[model samples]
Each structure stands twice: as C-alpha cells, then as structure tokens.
Target: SRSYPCDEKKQNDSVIAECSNRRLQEVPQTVGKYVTELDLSDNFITHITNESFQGLQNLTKINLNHNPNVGLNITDGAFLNLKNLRELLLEDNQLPQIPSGLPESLTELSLIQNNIYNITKEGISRLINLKNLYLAWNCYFNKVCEKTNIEDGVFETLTNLELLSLSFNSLSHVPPKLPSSLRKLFLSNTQIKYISEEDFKGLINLTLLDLSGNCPRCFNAPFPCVPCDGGASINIDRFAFQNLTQLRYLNLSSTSLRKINAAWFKNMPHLKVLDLEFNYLVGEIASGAFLTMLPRLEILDLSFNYIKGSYPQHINISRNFSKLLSLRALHLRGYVFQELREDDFQPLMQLPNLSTINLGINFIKQIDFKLFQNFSNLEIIYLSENRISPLFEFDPHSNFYHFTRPLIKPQCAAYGKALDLSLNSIFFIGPNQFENLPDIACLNLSANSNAQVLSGTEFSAIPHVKYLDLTNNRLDFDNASALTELSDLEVLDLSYNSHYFRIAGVTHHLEFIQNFTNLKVLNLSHNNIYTLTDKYNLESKSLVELVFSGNRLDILWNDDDNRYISIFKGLKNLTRLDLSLNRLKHIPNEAFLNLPASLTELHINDNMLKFFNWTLLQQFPRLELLDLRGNKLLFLTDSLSDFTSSLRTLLLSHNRISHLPSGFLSEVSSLKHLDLSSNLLKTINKSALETKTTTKLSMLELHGNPFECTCDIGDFRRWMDEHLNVKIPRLVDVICASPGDQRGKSIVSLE
Candidate 1:
C-alpha cells in the first residue's frame, strides 16, 4: 500500500525506508517494523516472492536496482526474512544466477546489468561476507550475449573480496583464482588478447588496474579499433606489471603498447596514474630507459601517441625523463610535433614537481624560454593546435647546437601561469602580445586561424587575466582593446565571432568591456546581434552570467516603435539570462526597460515567439526560471499583475499553446513548476479551473496534450481528483484524444 510516503530515513537509531521511484509493483506491505535502509530502487519490481521481506526485521540496505523491463525474478527464499541483510543491489536486473537464498549477511554485491553468462563457483560460494563485486555489463548490446565465463574458483570464495568488475565482457582470458583480497581490478572493455604473466598472479592486494579496451591498437588511431584475436595487438608479458606490488592506478589506455620495456615498471613502486593513451608509441620512446622505472609517476598520458621525430627532435625527453622526480601531470596530446628545440625540455630541468604540461596537437613551429628556464612550479601550458603564426617566437634563436646566449632567464618567476595558445595560426595580437608572459591567469586564444587582431594593448600583457577565450576567431575588433586591464576578469568567451565581411554583429567595440570590475560569465553566443545600441550601454557592477544566444536581437531593433533605451544600462549583478537561439519574433518593450533587476534565470528558448507584452514580466523582480521552450506560442494574456514574483519554473513546452486564458495563473503566486507540455492542451475546462487551484501549484505538467477525455475533461478530472496531491508528471501515461470510445484510454482515467 504505497504510491509515495516511504522516504523515511532516521539512521543508526534505525528507520530508513526511502522507496525509490515509487511506481512500485509489489513489496510494500507498508515497510514498517523499524526499517533500516530499504530503497526499492526505480520500482516496478517484477517478483521476489518468499513473502518479499515479511516484517522487515531491521533490514540492512536493500536497493533492487533498475528492475529491467518486467523480467526480474527471484524465488528460492528471497531474502529469507532478512537476517540483517547487508547491502544487495541487484543492478539493472534480469538475473539468471546467483540469487538463490541470498542473505548470508550480504556484504555489498551489485551484479551489474545482469543476464549472468556463467561465473559459477557454486555461483558465489555463499557470499563469504562479500565486499564489493560488480559483474559489469554482461552483453546484450555490443552483441555477444553468451560466451562469458568466469569459472576457475570463481572468486576463490569471496575471501572478503575488495572490489571486482569484469567490465564489458566476453572474456578472452584472465579469470583464474582471483580474490587475494583484490583491492580494485576492472578488466576494461574485454575480449582480452594477451597478458600472460600469470595474469596478475595473486593480486597481492591489487590497488587499481584497468587494462583499457582490451587489445585495441587501431593503426593510425583516432578511435574505433579492435584486434588481438589473430590480428594481434595486446601482448604484454615483459612480466606483465610484474606482480603489481601495491599497484596504484595503471590504465594501459587503448593497449596497443608497442615496446617501452623496463621489465614493465620493475615492481611498480606505488605507481601513480600511467595511462598510455591511444598507443602506437614510436621513436622507440627516445631510447626507452623505460621512464627510469616510474619513481612514483604522477599522471602521464602520452596522448594519441603517433610519436616519430626530426624537427626539434621529438620523443626524446632527454633520455629517461630525468628520473621522473615524481612527475606531475604531463600529457603530450596528439604529438604531431614539429619544433620546440633548446634542448627540448632539457631533461625536464630536474623535475621539481613539474606542474601540468600538455603540448596540444603539436604542429609547433618554434619555441624558446630555454624550454621553461628552470621550471619553478610551472602551472599549465598546453600550446593548443599549433602553427604559431605572425608572432610568438618568444626568444627563438637556436640553430641546433649554437645559441649565442640570452634565452631570457634571470630567475624566471614563470609568472602566474595557465596558457593555451588555442588552435593557432594566430593572425595578429600586436600590443604587448602577452608581453613576455607576465602574470597570466588562464588564457586561450580560441580557434585562432587568421584571427584578425587583438591589439588593445593586448590585455595590458596579461594583467593577471582571469579566464579569457577568444572563441572561434575572425575578429575585426575595429580598434577594440579596452579590457580595462582585465581587472582580474572572470570568465569571458567571445563566442563564435562570425563576421565574414563586416557588420554581421558584435562589435560596437563591445562597449570596451565595461571597465570590467571583475566581470563574471559573459558569452556572446553566435554573435549576429542585430542591435543593442543606446551606444550599447553595458555597464556592470560585477556582472553575473549573460549569454545572448544565437542572436539577431529580433531584427532591426524589434520595430513597432524602436526604442533601444538602456541596453542593460548597468547590469546590476545580472543573474542568468541566455536568450536562446534568438529568431525571436518580438519582446521589445524598450528592450526590457532596463533589464537585469537581478534576473534569476531566463532563457527564451528556440524562438519565433507569437506574443508578448505581458508587461515585460515586470522587469524581472527576481524571476525564477522561465524558459518558453521552442516558441510560436499561440496564446497567453490575462494581464498577470504582480507577474513573476519569484516564479518557480514555467517552461511551456514546444509551444502552439491553444489555451490557458481566464485568470491565467492568477498573478503567479510564487508558482511552483508548470509546463504546459506539448501544447494545444485540449481540455482542463471551467475557465481552466478558475485560476487559484489554490496557489503554490506543485508541478503540473500536462503531458503531450490532446487530452479530450470527455465531459470536457471532467473538471480536469474533478480538479485532478481533488488535487490528488497535484503532481501530474506523465499522469499515468496520459492518453485519450477523442470520443471514439475513449480513444487510447487513460486521460487520468475519465469516469
């Protein structure tokens, strides 16, 4: 007897029902008897007999996860009167095994997305206090819904199993004894090709090991490749991770691993994150001294590894990466390398805790800074998609082995970092072009192809920039350049700077970034902005989130009496405003009089809006969520007086809205969620039920309406059966569209 009301929770001093998703199909004899955590996860529970927990004697955690399409079954003494059952979450169930009389005081067993294609060691040898076991996506989608076996001492009697996941399986190998109290083992995307060094022998307290996408090694690799059956790929056995001595996260990404042996990291001395990303690792890794045997390696990805050599002599991190001195985040993204000489990272200048470095998409032309002088905690430098044009030589004068001197050092402070010359070909940046990198705080010259120019004293040479991205460049910033010295700017992305030949949108020199008094979130999306003029009066007192989505600003100042007043005059701490996909048909009330009365969320979704003028929503007096979804809205006008005073969610789904007039939502009495779903709402009669269905409506989304369930919706089905606690979200599969004998039935079950 429960459709709701089970969310109880008190804890330790017991009681914790919390019935998940509530569309429960069975077990609900009012879960009482001192409940101790029993969440019937995403319910529709198919079956679990044995009186499905009769008198839950202080149950101890039970979440029957995602009851797979009504096929869940379990009978042989279900939980046998919960003898303090301890954690049993049958994830995405259909279970065809190991559910026989469970409750050996279970200790966390998740049978992930089941169908169980064999694992029989007496099907889990009586849960010896199991400790975390997730069986993983046992087929059904990537085909092979069978061949998966786990046999060989299944889990060696769950000797306190400590995390095990078979991962997307069809299993080609490694499934032997296992359970030396494993401490995390995943076997990722498996069909396992080869790794025979006794496949992680006695997982001696394994501490994380993944084996990424089985035997992958797709040649020119860019994604999607699978081999290792006979096509041969993954063949690790240089003593395969030689007895993971307390391994610490080792994900051999895309496992094509082409030679880099140092006896597979000798005895992994507490290794720390080593993912060989999409491998084909060549250039014999510049004489692979096998990274001086990972001395506590800290995050090393080798991205896209198509590594070769020549210009600036790639792949040779000065042999043996200078004994990894506990490296700190080094990726090498898509090494399409070209030039970066000056002892290309002279053996990582004595790795003093190297701080984040990724040579992004490398097609690099030239570079210097004697390769980061004496790296002093260098902070993030990615050099994105390089070509390095028109500028950025950064002290380049090295002809192989003759560099006269002066490479700019003097105890380089490396000055406030974070730099990513985004997608470069850079066309112009004139003024102090990042004046020898002074105090940079995150800068990403986005998509710079022929990036016109950015000469406004070029960020006064990184006046401690706080997040700046010149999005999809084509810039014609006429003479644009007043980032008012990036007053520690905060989030600024000049989105999709179109303008193929001029005047398509965005530059009234963009009011020179209104003396950015600590700007906050400003993304001029798809800039084709038709107007904002009043000399674009955009002032801000610490601006707060504003994105003019795919603009046109409703063509020619939304005529009908053009007034362009104070284009957001002084954004008094604006709060969320997106103007979504602006094909907006009209909303020009002198451009919202002086919008930004601390707007609290407003995204005029996909537009062609058919009507407006509802007193321009009393200029957002703290509005709360109003997204007129895909609009062409056919109606809505009953003079909503105090309009949106803290209105709470009003979406009006894919509009063509056919009704909702009389006293339409009586002055939004702090509305609490209302979405006229797939509009043209057929009937909710009685002048749409005389407004005030007693205010504070609690979520009433009329699903895909055509709901003409006769008696003209029987007073919206007697005001939804006396406000059946108003929460009609998909009211039981909203049906009925005609009188053809109650069409497809269910329109809240019309009597």
Candidate 2:
C-alpha cells in the first residue's frame, strides 16, 4: 500500500533506496535493483523469511531494528542471498537467538537489547570478515542467574574482530579469551566481577579498552541508560593489562574505584589517553602516580572526583603528577574542594610538553595568589568560575620559580599558551600573575563582576599580550587609570558593565584611554552608560570604530564644560560610528567637528531626534551614508539645503514628515538615493522632483505613503503636469483616495 513515482525522491546519488512506514508487512516489490543500502525500520512487518532479501546481491547495509510490540521474527535463512551485506542491525527485537544464516561477508553486527543467549561458533564460523560486534543489554535467559556463558570456540571464528562491546549485560566474567586482533572493547555497565591474567592471555596488540559503568550513566546518545554494574566491584588484576603492550586509550569512569592501581600503568607502555572522570577515589591515590604513564601519553581527564582529601588536593596532585615526558592536554576542571594554593601545582613543572589545563567551577581559593608562578614553559591554565575573593585593591604578583628550573635541561617542550580566569568570584587581582606566561598571547578574565577595580601594575611583564577579554568583569568605569599601560594590547571586551560620563557620575571613566594609542576595535555594549562627554584627555587616536548604541544620551560634546569642542580631538583615525538607539533629541552642533576626517558611514537610527541640523553636519568633508530611521523628525530642515560634503545614501524611513523640503539637496551634491517609507506625506509637489532632476536620482523608497487616487492622480495627471511630468514618485506607492475611503487600495489602478 505505498505510492512512489519514478522520481518520488532523489535516487540518482543515493545508491540507497528506502522503504519505510507505509504499513509494510512485506518488503517493497522494486526499490532500485542496484541499491547498496536499504532501510525497513519502524514498519508493520512481523516475519522475515529467505524471500525477504532473496536477490539483493549488491546490498551491503540493512537496518532491521524495531520496538517491543513492533518487533520482527526472522527464520534461519532470512538474509540468505545478500552475499555482499556488510552491516546488519537487529536491535530492540524479541528474538531469543541471532538469526542463523546471516551472510558470511558481514563485517559489523548489533544484537543489542534482545532476549539473546549463547553465541555458537558454528552459527558464525564463516563470518571471518566481522570486525565490530555489539551484543550487549540482554545476554541472560531471564536477566538474572540465567546469565549466558560463552563456550571456548565461540570467538575462535572471529579472527578479524577488532572491536567488541558487551556493555549492559549480565556476564559475571569476560567472554573467555580474546584474540590479539582486537583493538577496542567497550564492556561498561556490565556485571563482570573480576579482571584476571588468565582471562586475557594473549591481547598483545589490543589498543583501546573500556570497562564498566564508572562514568556518569548518560554518556552520549539520548537513548535510555542500560542498567549499571553496582560499582567498580570486580577485582582488577594489577598486571592483567601487562600483555596489552600496544593499548592506547582506556576509559575507567564512574566505577567507584577507591584507588588507581599504581603498578597497572607500566604495562600500558604506549597508552595515549586515559579517562578517569567521575570516580570515588577519596583517600587512595598512589604517590607519584602518573610517572609510570610516561613517554607516549598525551591527554588525561580526572574531573569530578573527591580529591579534596584530609589535605588540599592540589598539593597532593602536585606530588603525584611529577612526570618525565609526552603529555600535552589535561582536564582538572571541577572538584568540590573549597581551596587550592599556588604551590599545589608544583610537580606539573616536571612535565616537559604541558600546554593546556582547565580547573574551573569549584569553590576554591588561596589567601594570597600568583597565577602560574612556576614553569615559564607552561602555556595555558583555566582558573575561572571559582569562588575566589580578595581583600585588597588589584596589584600584580609574578612568580618565576619554575622558569629557571625547567630551563635547566628539561626533556619536554611547551609553547603558545593562553589563560582564562573568567567568572571566578574575584573582587581583586594583585598584578604580575598574568604576565610572563610562556608565549602568552590571549587571556580571558571575562564573566566575573568583582575584577572591576583594576590598577595599572596588574599586567606588567606580559609584553607581547594582544587580546585581553575583561568583558562582564565590570572594569574601572568610575576611574580607569588601570588601563594606563598595555601599549601592545588591541582587542579588549568591556561588555555588560554600566558607567556614565556625566559630571554627576563622571570621574574619568576612561581618561587613561589616551595611552591605548594602538587600539583598533573596542567593545562597550550592554553597559547602560548615561553620558559620553569626550573630555580632551579621553582619546584613542588609532581607534577605528565606536559602537555606542543602547545608552542614555540626549546630546554629545567634549564637555567637562570644556573650552573648545575637542572631546574627540585625538581620535583622528575613527572610521565608523554608531550613535543609534539612544536618548538624543539633538546633535551637539560643534561636537561634529572633532569626528575623524576619515569617517564615512554613520548610523543615528532609532533615537529621539526631532530635527536634523544639517547646518552643523557640513563639518565632515568625507561623510557619505547616513541612517536616520525610526526617529521623531517631522521634516528635513533648511539646514539640509546648504552644500559642502559628499553625502550619498540617506535613509529616512518610518518618520512623520509630510513632504520633501522643496529644493535641490545640493548640500552635498553626491545624493543618489533617498528612502521615505512609512511616513505621512499625502502628496508630492512638482518642485519636489527637482532634487532628483539635479542629481539624476538613483533610488527612492516611497512605500506605505498615503496618496489620493482621484483626478489628482488620473488622466490629465499624465499630461506632463507643467513640471517635468510623469506621475508623482509612485502611482505604485499611491492608490485610490489612499487616504480614508480608499485606504487599502493600490494607486496604480486609478487609470
């Protein structure tokens, strides 16, 4: 009961034909004879016989998984002629045993969550090409003492097997002895009791191995969590992995392991990654633990553990983490500990290739502080999102204890490091801690409100620093003498903190900005600023653009009630400026004189301006485009008639002006486009077309304006009007009475 035309879907590039959810109780008749992949999931089919896939020789993949009531029963030879089949999925079904006649060419198979038991060698002896097998979730006859057991030769036929996942099963022991060809194994959330040398006799070539539900239950897919193994219950054979000399990655997460078998690592000589996240190893971490995992390892994750012991965790970790070679990335992100000291990271200096480490979101602190005092070779460290509080004003504290020591002929290498200490409850920052980090380039101390009151010395020896993000930290908005230094700094984010430059709240919010002569881009958004009086001292001559939208400013000028309008005097290089969405009723006349001569684009939309003083706008010789949309202006003043600059694109939509100002806008001579949409103009005068006749007007937006559709717009209206005739700007933007009675009609229909 399916309807599919020859071109129903794209079958040209798919080489994949899909037959699904059409209430199919049987495979569709014809779905591209050359199809290599087919999907029949979620169908109403109940039985699968040899005829189900009789002649699909080119078929290499098949999906046949279903739910409880929508399950399928397959006979022994159900997939008999799919000789090229490489993958088969039969999960979530009610079958008691794997279908017998699966193609011998299948390389991947999954029998997850089924009422399966026993895997006979004869049932799979010919599938020597199989590499990946997932037979987890339901291996018991009844999910209890009826747990299935594997006879000796079961895997003797799977000589090419490289990956075997048996997670969430009821096995009390491993599946006999594994072949040396196995590379990756996931056996988590199972009931395996113990790991012993006898069970893993010859896995010398095994590379990656995962054992037990040690990590948090919900790992990746949105699927349900398979029942977990009570804890890290099964005993571990210390040297059981000694035979796996080529093992590379091992994940032993959330296993309730109380101790890391110190002697276990020497066996994994080439292990590169170790994931021990979320364990309950409270009191028993071996001293000098990671030294044995040397030479070839790179990343190690040990977050979410009770490492806060009878003593501080960092100091203990410092002693145990003393390493010799080959480690790059490490994650010590979250621990419930309340405090950590500088010296706690002492042994990390021993690592030669250490680069990045994260230790955020913990309620930790030390009475006194210096960031990364040791190891000048260290590149990055994350100390943000913690509960740290300081008592005094900010000062710089530099520690170079590890600098000289690591230079004393160390075996490792490190470089190009950055640091992120944002969102920690830091109310103070004594300087020098951020400077001198190895090849330091960027530092992000954003998202914390307390690191606001900065002092100059807070960033000292860090000479090459370029990008510093102090956003959301609420820097010295009241008096920022703190930014006096930082000659090499360029991009600084000071978002989400409010500061007004009014004589009432103004005490020199950025008086020190003159020193930021090299600043090209600066962000001051979301700061609820009340004023923007550019005092002569507040200048960044090299500043390229200033985005000051969403503030409360009625007018702008170089005022501390100053002598001349030199507020923006030193900023002679600013190119683009946005003063939109603010509280401005007037453009402080003389203030426009200080704008950089390089200024081209200007946006003053969404404000409270009643009249644009074009007289004062003639100061800029290079000003071109102007955006004045969404304002309270009733008309363009005569000041716009005066000429001087080269203004081109002038946007004035959504205002209340009734008509054009009736004159040539030679004020700048370069006017080529005009936007007058959604206004109250009832008619257009013949004299109004002069501005267009002069500049040969390019684009005019007159949409949503009221125009009468009667005699004023019809017949004689096309009679060349006595003035360069041609119906007004728009018979299109005009129609019917277009005023009251003909409100909703188009003007072009008047003829």
Candidate 3:
C-alpha cells in the first residue's frame, strides 16, 4: 500500500505524480520531492541514481518527455536542493549529457531529444542562471568554445543568456564568445561551417537570428568580405553583422549565398526581418545596393534566390531609405522584377506605407498601366507564376471599347481592382475585349491556354465587375453568355472547361447566366458535365459555390421529380455543393430534399456510387464538407446513419468499401476530417470503434486499404498508427487491389 495524500496543514508543496505505462524500476520515491511538474513521460524509466531528486525541494518543471529507458546517472549534488529550479524538459528522453547537478536556478533548459556530444567546461560553468537554452534535437552537440578548448570563462558563465536553441546539432565549429544577453539565436539543423572572427565576439545583445538548416560547406575558411564578380562569389559578411547594432531578425535560409553586392547591408542599420530565402543568389541587385544599406529595412525576404536576369539591375532606395517611411512588406519571389522599361515604378510610387507587394515567381512579362500610374496607394498585387500573355496589337478598329488602350478604364470607377492572370498561355480575349476592364473588380483568367470566347462587346464591357475567374479557359456555354453584362457579378469560375466534347454551343451556353442576376460563386469544376438534367434551370437564383467536379456525370437519378422540384424551388439561395467526379448511381431521395437548409458544403467525391441514399443527407441540415472520396461504395446504408449530426468533412476515400456500416460514423458527433483512405477493407467492425456519443474524431484518414494485414488488422493499424490525432492522407498512388501477394505494392511504405 503505497500512497501519499497527506496535506500537513496545507503546504504539501506541488505534487502530482503518475508514473504512466509503469514499467518502473527505480527513482519513484519522493518522486522528486514536492514535484513541481515532473512527468516521467512514457515511463519505462530505466535507471536514475544520485538520489534522483531525492528530496526535490520544490522542483520546477522537469518533464522527461518520451522515455525509452536509457540508464540516467545524474550526480553532483544531483540538482542541489532544487534551488527554485526553472524548466528542464528532456525531450524524447534520450539523454546523454548536461544532466549533472543542473540547477543554478537554471532558467529554462531543455535537452531536446538528447544524445549530447560536447559543451563541456564542467558543462557550461554549471548553468549560471541560463535563460532559455534548448539544445534542440541533439546528437554530437558542440558549442563549448567550439573545439579550440578555449573555455576560459566559458560563456561568461551564461551571463543571463536569452533564448539560444542549437537546432538539430552536429556542430562543426563556429561558437566563440556570445552572451551579451544573447537575444534569440537558433542554429538550425546544424553542422555549421566557418563563422570564426572569434565567432561574433560576444553577441552585443543579438536580436533574433537563425542560420537555417545548416551544413554550410563545412567551414572552408575565407568568409567575410563577400560580393564578387565573373565566375561568381558573393558572401557579404560585412564583419558578420558587425556588432549587430541591435539587429532585428535575420535568417540566412538555405545559405549558399552565391552573390549579393551593394555592400551587403553595410552593417545592417537596424534591419527588421531580412531573410534571403533559399539562396544561391546568382547575381543582380547592384544599383545602389538597396540604396545605401537597408535604412531601417522592414520585412524584406528575397524568396528562393538564384536570380539571373529580368529586373534587379539596380535598386538604390537611399535618402536614408526615404526617411524609412516605415517601409512595409516587400518580398520579390523568385527574384527578377525585370524589364520594367517605363520609369521602373518611378521610385516605388513614392512609397506611402507601401501596402503589400509580392511579384511572385517573377519574370514579369509585361505591364503598362502607365507602370501602375504611381501605385495609387496600391493594395495587394501578386501576379501569380508570371509569364502573363494576351497582349496583342493587331487592331481591327479595336472595338470592345478600345481594347485596353490607355490601359483599363471601362468606367464604373474602376471598382475594387484585382487582376491576376494565372499560369499562362493566354489564347484570346479579342471580342469586345472585356470592354477595357471597367474597373476590374476581381478578374483572374485562370491557367490560361488562350481564354476562348467572350464574344461581341464582352458583356458590354464589365459594368462594375465583382469576381470573375474564367478557370482553365477554353470556355464553352457557347461563348459563355458573353458574361451577361456583368451586372455586378459575383464569383463565377467556369472550371476546367471541356464542356463535354461535342461543343457546338453546348446547351445554349447557360443562356448567358440568365442575366447573371447577381450570381454568387459558381465553378463548374473539371468540366465535361454529362448533364445536370439539362442544366437544372428555373433561373439559377443567387447560387453559391456550386462546383461540378470532374464530370461525365453518369447518373444522379431524378429524371423529373417535378423537375427536381422546380429546380430546387429556384435554388433557394443554395450554398456550396459540388457533385464531384460524376456518374452517380442513385441520389434522389428527393434530390437532397431540394437542398437549401442553407446547404453548407457537399462534394460527392468521384462517382459511380454503390449505395448512398442516406435519406439525401437528411434534408440538408447545413452539412459541412462531405466529399465522399472516389466512389463505387459498398456499404454504409441504413439511410447513411441519418446525417450523423450534420456531418463535418467525411471524404470516404477511394472506394469499394468492405465494412464500416453498423451505425457507420456512430451518429457522427461532428466528425472533422475522416477520409477512410483507399478502400476495400479487411476488417474494422469493433462497432466501428464504439461510440454512442462524444465523437470528435479530428482527422483519421486510414492509409490506403485492402487491409488483410492479419491480427485483426493489428488493432486498427495500431490505433491508426498510434492514437490517431490527425493528418494521415499521404496517399502516394494508393495501391494494392486484390490479395495477390500485395498486388501493385504501395500503401505507404516508400521511405
């Protein structure tokens, strides 16, 4: 009978013990006296001596996170009466070092997944008030005067350190002084190369810096004066952040920095988050090299660099960075804002708090709205994956209101301008050429391949547009009602149009959206629509998110249930519904009971259903995300468990189901993401994981199925690969058809 619940006059100090998975053998008494958070995480606690916190005097947070037993031999006054111990979480409990005496009032210390190799000098002068020091995912860790055995005053006894996590260590030199109250320093995935210079002499109050996932060519010396020419070579160390000057956040991502001139940050004058993302640098960026050095720079991340040609010949930005007008965000993706002949953004439109601007995947084919006529207080402009086509010159009396002449001005006061020309191969748009973008609201001609038809007068020149994306163009609907004169349109994307081959004015091309009548989101996903029973009309009222995914819709029943009840009684303001890849076998239980209980979201995933008459989703009580993944189901009848509490994300992954019926989703209980991965299961009927209530299955996408992996499918595949919490669908070609000795392999193994 072992128990301790004595509250001697209420001062039992904090004690909450529970040797979980008890396979314990030692160090269990006084369980670190008056325990102040000491979880022997995943216990199998091998061994720990030196009176392992024998009488732990008010211990302060010591979670041996994930214990796999390894024989811990802590000594030297083993924590010296826990002098108000701060944090000490031994991650993954794989300790090897830094576990002696520890507790000079240690200020937050975590030996992350340990294996610790170096850092001696009596182990960092016995943690002199170390403030947050986590040796992340350790293994061959260094940093004890980095090799040179120069631990004279070792980190000046950690002078009140401030956040220093040596990430995934393997450390290869580069660790000299550093403790001027260091402020945030994470040496990511280390193996770090040359950083000598006495390794940044005592970081003067360093301000946030991470040398992302390093390996850095294993220190080959010569690394400071950067910025070269011809056969390349740009380092720009500028004395390794010359005394930081209270630097603000700098990450040298992927570091291999091939080139960067303009005196690379002449000692960064108060920089503010400058991460030269994934570098190889390649060249360019000379003109005024950031105009006299980052004058109070503000968030400038040069994404994945290797930059070659096309914009970046020069950029001066001086004048004390134009009085640092609080320079807002500026990230030039894949670098090269090139060929902008016309007054190259005339000094960035006199930056007035430059809103957001990321010329993504740049090369910027062409843009002449007078070079954005002085960015009239620009707001978000991203020009996705650029190459930007459709810029003809063959004017046959440029109709359509002067085919974009003098650049965009179709009246209606240029409403909410948003223009993103996706991917690109832009075919044509000539007919009434969008009447010169009448104040283009939101017009993204998705993945262009020459945007097919928009016939005559292009919907009378967009009258105050509102979100019109011609998805994967090759448009049909016989010329897509020329966009029904926009009438303040609202989200209309004719998804991947192929409009079912035999195109000769397919079904009167949606009668030009019946005059759009303020359409509300309608994306005909991966088209080839094999009929929605002749385009269920009744004047598609303000529809909402109706995407007919990958079509060829074989059948969704309802030949005429009163014409699907007069077209869903005039669509009663439908809300989100995608009949995924079609060929649905049978659905009409009154066709979703004529939807509109404010239908939340529904994507009848890939079709050719087997059995899905779930009372038509219990008459739409606001279902949410129900993508029944690739179909041809085999079970789950009984009216589909009556909408299992308004279901929430249930994609039944590729199908041909084998089990999972009985109370199927146990009355759902608000399921959140439960994709049964590839199907044709072998066994799963433990009442489908018992549950009459309390169901919050946050993600459970079982890896591709065809499970016959014996042992009753190994307890639900070891509880969905260890107590299922979420994120599993890593379906890489999901294989294994019939039991022919693992037919076609794959099911999630490939390293």
lDDT per residue as tens, model 2, 386-443 = 7666531111011100111231111111213566667766556656455435545566
What ranking of all candidate models by lDDT puts the best one first?
1, 2, 3
Model 3 lDDT on a 0 to 1 scale = 0.59
Model 3: what TM-score? 0.32
Clashes (candidate 1): 0
Off by over 4 Å in 3: 1-341, 346-480, 483-561, 565-587, 590-751
**How does each model score on lDDT?**
0.72, 0.63, 0.59
- Candidates ranked by TM-score: 2, 1, 3
TM-score of each: 0.38, 0.57, 0.32
| TM-score, candidate number 1 | 0.38
Q: Give the alpha carbon lDDT tens digit for every residue of 218-327 in model 3.
A: 22223211222232322334466667677788776555565554444566667777666656543433233454466567666666563443355432232333443555
